[PDB]
Design a protein around this ligand. Structure first.
Ligand SMILES: [Mg+2]
Ligand SMILES: [Mg+2]
Length: 181
């Protein structure tokens, strides 16, 4: 029976990873970020939204639960495959860019760490400052940074309330940004 069970759960795992990743990608594509909030609709701005939503998932999943730690590894794997391809779309290959993937991973984990510290401290000012630094560094004041920060705080709250069991089964959700006010 154990081979049958291992195979069934391995197949199910692939279906779970696909649906979880698709939910994250859809959340990052919500139109309000690029219309009202003035997140740039550019290769880099779209990366800032994907990385923000991937961060939120990893931040929730990190802990002592083996199933959630494994799902986090899967989502990180899919994210870095995605970003690899996005860089190649801009002519950023390995030619003249040694250690490209190692540098990208440092770009991700280093820049989203400020989001984690701000969320753990429930510090909305720190969160808006980190979002401005990462997404609209051209502006000393970004009028919609506090709006995006409110959305990020509410997503953290929602993700935390989902049970470990439901999340490991693929039942992830984010807030509808259009309902933020
Ligand atoms: Mg995989
Ligand atoms: Mg792409």
């Amino acid at each position: 029976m154990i081979l049958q069970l291992f195979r069934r759960k391995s197949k199910a795992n692939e279906a779970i990873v696909l649906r979880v990743y698709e939910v994250i990608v859809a959340a990052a594509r919500q139109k309000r970020f690029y219309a009202q909030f003035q997140v740039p609709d550019t290769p880099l701005g779209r990366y800032e939204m994907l990385s923000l939503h991937i961060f939120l998932a990893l931040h929730r999943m990190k802990g002592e639960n083996p199933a959630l730690n494994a799902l986090a590894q899967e989502i990180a794997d899919e994210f870095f495959k995605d970003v690899d391809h996005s860089l190649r779309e801009l002519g950023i290959g390995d030619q003249g860019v040694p250690k490209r993937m190692k540098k990208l991973a440092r770009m991700f984990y280093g820049r989203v760490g400020a989001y984690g510290a701000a969320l753990d401290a429930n510090d909305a000012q720190a969160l808006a400052a980190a979002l401005t630094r990462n997404i609209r560094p051209d502006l000393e004041f970004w009028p919609h940074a506090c709006y995006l920060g409110a959305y990020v705080l509410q997503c953290r709250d929602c993700l935390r309330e989902i049970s470990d069991e439901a999340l490991a089964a693929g039942d992830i959700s984010y807030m509808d940004v259009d309902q933020v006010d």
